[PDB]
């Protein structure tokens, strides 16, 4: 039960990392595209 | 008990991903700022 709560909290952490990774990927791609267009 | 140990190991993995994401975000921002300043 505390074990399940752990896993739920871990799942929130994971969704936070997913958010982060997607933000970074968009930003790196924007920079690659800027360099290409220059 | 092995279940708890699993979750603990998973938690170490997650903290490693957090470290990674924060390193990347600082580095991408430094590049965006460099391009802006040029």
């Amino acid at each position: 039960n505390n074990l399940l709560r752990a896993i739920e909290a871990q799942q929130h952490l994971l969704q936070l990392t997913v958010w982060g990774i997607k933000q970074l990927q968009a930003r790196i791609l924007a920079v690659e595209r800027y360099l290409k267009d220059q | 008990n092995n279940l708890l140990r699993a979750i603990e190991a998973q938690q170490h993995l997650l903290q490693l991903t957090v470290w990674g994401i924060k390193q990347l975000q600082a580095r991408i921002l430094a590049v965006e700022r460099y391009l802006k300043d040029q």
Binding site: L13, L16 | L4
Partner: peptide, 22 residues
């Protein structure tokens, strides 16, 4: 990202206390 930093710390602390109670 300041809000992210804080949600990370919050769920990390919550997880570590739950692992302890287990």
């Amino acid at each position: 990202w300041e809000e992210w930093d804080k949600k990370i710390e919050e769920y990390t602390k919550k997880i570590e206390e739950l692992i302890k109670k287990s």
